[PDB]
Automatic annotation (TrEMBL), chain A:
<protein>
    <recommendedName>
        <fullName>Envelopment polyprotein</fullName>
    </recommendedName>
</protein>
<feature type="glycosylation site" description="N-linked (GlcNAc...) asparagine">
    <location>
        <position position="16"/>
    </location>
</feature>
<comment type="similarity">
    <text>Belongs to the phlebovirus envelope glycoprotein family.</text>
</comment>
Automatic annotation (TrEMBL), chain B:
<protein>
    <recommendedName>
        <fullName>Envelopment polyprotein</fullName>
    </recommendedName>
</protein>
<feature type="disulfide bond">
    <location>
        <begin position="43"/>
        <end position="46"/>
    </location>
</feature>
<comment type="similarity">
    <text>Belongs to the phlebovirus envelope glycoprotein family.</text>
</comment>
UniProtKB/TrEMBL annotation, chain C:
<comment type="similarity">
    <text>Belongs to the phlebovirus envelope glycoprotein family.</text>
</comment>
<feature type="disulfide bond">
    <location>
        <begin position="28"/>
        <end position="33"/>
    </location>
</feature>
<protein>
    <recommendedName>
        <fullName>Envelopment polyprotein</fullName>
    </recommendedName>
</protein>
Length: 51, 51, 51
């Protein structure tokens, strides 16, 4: 749909922002911060039961 | 004929080599020193949740 | 009873050698064996373990 499906991803590293998520169906890239934090991104899926 | 066992040949790793001089003596050398000094003592960022 | 099979040439006098057993055996004679006499040759052997 329009807004899509939002998925929260948590990371932990020493670098400020070095990340690149790649998967089938949709590709989403975002920026992170130093340390452990919480981030929310949205992807495009074409199935009700996302497994 | 001089009293000696003759020339000596040494094999090392399957190959026969004819050296110039053969002897066993001492020699000043150095050693490897690893000062780790608590490289990774204790550091982790996590959280707990209930379901 | 002589078991000291060290004619001032073996590498047993080291700190990295470890434990072993000073053994000995017999040898052959001839041009292909190393000498020029029809008599067994004294051949010494030393084994040990490493890490
Ligand atoms: C990482 O972010 C901090 C705070 O925003 C900043 O002080 C630092 O210079 C940044 N480092 C790099 C390599 O961008």
């Amino acid at each position: 749909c329009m807004t899509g499906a939002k998925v929260s991803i948590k990371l932990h590293s020493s670098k400020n922002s070095t990340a690149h998520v790649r998967c089938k169906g949709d590709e989403t890239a975002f920026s992170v911060l130093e340390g452990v934090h919480s981030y929310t991104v949205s992807l495009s899926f074409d199935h009700a039961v996302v497994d | 004929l001089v009293h000696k066992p003759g020339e000596v040949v040494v094999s090392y790793g399957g190959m026969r080599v004819r050296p110039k001089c053969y002897g066993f003596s001492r020699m000043m050398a150095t050693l490897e020193v690893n000062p780790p000094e608590q490289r990774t003592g204790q550091c982790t960022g996590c959280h707990l949740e209930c379901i | 009873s002589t078991s000291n099979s060290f004619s001032d040439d073996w590498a047993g006098k080291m700190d990295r050698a470890g434990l072993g057993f000073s053994g000995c055996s017999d040898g052959c004679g001839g041009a292909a064996c190393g000498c020029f006499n029809a008599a067994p040759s004294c051949i010494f052997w030393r084994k040990w373990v490493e890490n």
